[PDB]
Amino acid sequence: YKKDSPFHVMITSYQLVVSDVAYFQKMKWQYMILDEAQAIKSSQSSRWKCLLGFHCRNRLLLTGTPIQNNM
DNA sequence: TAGGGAGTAATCCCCTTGGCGGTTAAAACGCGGGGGACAGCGCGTACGTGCGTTTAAGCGGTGCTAGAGCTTGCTACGACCAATTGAGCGGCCTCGGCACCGGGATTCTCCA
């Protein structure tokens, strides 16, 4: 997108990237941020399984408590 | 020994029910009169009853052969599954069919 574009940064709930996943996986993302990435900490979670498969160049996991319960 | 199931409660999206308000159109209410419901009547004809006739349905009996019903043998074909793709579903788009309106024209009714 260039500066003349309908949007630049989109902000979304973890609830919607799962619910609207079929719309999200039909688009190509130039960068991704994940606030409180402890939400992604479980590999059996759909929000992990969904966001794993997003077509994105670069990703940040923002967290303050990375280690959590287990390796 | 470990993995994943059982328990539970917070989190958050979806969606059906209920209320408020208006307002407006359809249901409710009135009443005259008409005509259709319906009772009462006359006739006639058409249908139930009876008797003598006949006709053929039903029972007992003989003979035959088709074909239903069963056994045997085998191979053809549809169940099965792993690999491949394209037909058909879900989402998005737009324009043209159709409806709804208004007013002028033709039809149909009903009373004279």
Q: Tell me the CA–C1' distance in angstroms for A65 and B111.
A: 98
Q: DSSP labels for A4-68?
A: SSS-S-----HHHHHHTHHHHTTSEES-EEETTGGGG--TTSHHHHHHHTSEES-EEE--S--S-
Place of tokens 């688009």: A27
**Distances, alpha carbon A66 to alpha carbons A13, A36, A38, A58, in Å:** 20, 9, 7, 19
DSSP state of A69: S
**Distances, alpha carbon A14 to alpha carbons A1, A5, A6, A30, A37, in Å:** 24, 25, 23, 18, 10
Nucleotide nearest to A14 (CA to C1'): B12
Q: Tell me the CA–C1' distance in angstroms for A12 and B5.
A: 33
Rounded Cα gap, residues A32 and A11, in angstroms: 10
Q: Which nucleotides of B are covered by protein (CB under 7 A)?
A: 12-14, 92
A51: which 2 tokens? Answer: 């966001």
For chain A, give the number of residues.
Answer: 71
**Determination technique for this entry:** cryo-EM
A40: which 2 tokens? Answer: 């992604």
Q: Tell me the CA–C1' distance in angstroms for A61 and B111.
A: 93
